[PDB]
Amino acid sequence: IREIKAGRIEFRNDKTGAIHAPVGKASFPPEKLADNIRAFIRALEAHKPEGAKGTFLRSVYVTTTMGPSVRINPHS
RNA sequence: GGUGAAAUACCACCCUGGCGCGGCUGGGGGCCUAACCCUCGGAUGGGGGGACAGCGCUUGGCGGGCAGUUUGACUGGGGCG
């Protein structure tokens, strides 16, 4: 619960394979956004079920609640 | 707020079902015609078929027409038992 409040985020692929979560506060330091971004990258990459069969990490989108939307490379 | 298993804004990811156009690729129906077959009926040019079917290889399958084997031992015979 501690971190839940302290600095949390969670996983939960919806109906057909999608997750939703935060990885870098609003105006907040770009680099910071980068950090939580990649952090989730991994967290996820890890949770990745052994039952995958092909291009696992699919549609990688970063977008805003009510704002723009576009994919990103969980890599560089 | 309100209603339920669910929130109602706009902006995300993603599925069900159908349309537009764009890469791939499968099916299919049309004369032609130069390879090719037959051609020509008295001439190397005309005629009829024409991408088929001939035909080379690879595929699958009917398949006695054929080939080569086999279809046991005991048991007061063999076999049948």
Question: Which residue in A31, A16, A23, A13 sits closest to A62, CA to CA?
Answer: A23
Give this entry's resolution in angstroms.
5.0
Experimental technique of record: X-ray
- Pick out the nucleotide with least CA–C1' distance to A17: B14
Write the single-letter amino acid at A34. Answer: A
Antiparallel, parallel or unpaired: β A61-63 and A69-71: antiparallel
A29 token code pair: 């330091």
* Distance set, CA A60 to CA A2, A14, A17, A40, A45 (Å): 29, 15, 12, 12, 12
A40 token code pair: 């989730």
- Pick out the nucleotide with least CA–C1' distance to A67: B11
Residues with CB under 7 A from strand B: A 14-18, 20, 58-59, 61, 63-69
Write the single-letter amino acid at A75. Answer: H
Contact at 8 Å (CB) between A25 and A33? Answer: yes
CA A56 to centroid of chain Cα atoms: 14
Write the single-letter amino acid at A14. Answer: D
Measure CA of the first residue to CA of the last residue in chain A; give whole Å: 32
CA of residue A28 to C1' of nucleotide B49, angstroms: 83
